């Protein structure tokens, strides 16, 4: 950021870019190293009522595998065939 006008012009010309607008060295734009204290929010289970654990217990809703066939009609695929991808409209080609 302290480079002379000539040196700024020289390196801009050699690179073909406006290097001064996107310097890779950080100056004052960074955020201050001392910040005000946070006050973080709480989750949906922070309630005083209507909040029994048995109604929100994910682990106890897990089940053993469903056995569809044990040793003791239209054809099907594991899922529908995947759909063709669409070419990008942002920039289809490099």
């Amino acid at each position: 950021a302290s480079a002379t006008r000539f040196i700024q012009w020289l390196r801009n010309w050699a690179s073909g870019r406006d290097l001064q607008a996107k310097l890779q060295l950080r100056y004052q734009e960074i955020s201050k190293r001392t910040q005000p204290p946070p006050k973080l929010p709480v989750g949906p289970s922070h309630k005083l009522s209507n909040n029994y654990y048995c109604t929100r217990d994910g682990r106890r809703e897990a089940m053993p595998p469903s056995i569809v066939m044990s040793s003791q009609k239209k054809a099907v695929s594991p899922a529908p065939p995947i759909k063709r991808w669409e070419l990008s409209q942002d920039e289809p080609y490099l």
Binding site: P37, P38, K39, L40, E91, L94
Partner: protein, 44 residues
């Protein structure tokens, strides 16, 4: 009042990502012309 890291109201400004390699220089015709002109001046 809750305070956590959040984007500014209205979001951040646009960020560039697409390749930007500008075109520079003369055409092949002009470059050969300068080269050949330099040779002829030197020969002379």
């Amino acid at each position: 009042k809750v305070k956590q890291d959040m984007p500014p109201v209205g979001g951040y400004g646009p960020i560039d990502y697409k390749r930007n390699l500008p075109r520079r220089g003369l055409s092949g015709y002009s470059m050969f012309a300068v080269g050949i002109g330099a040779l002829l001046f030197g020969y002379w």
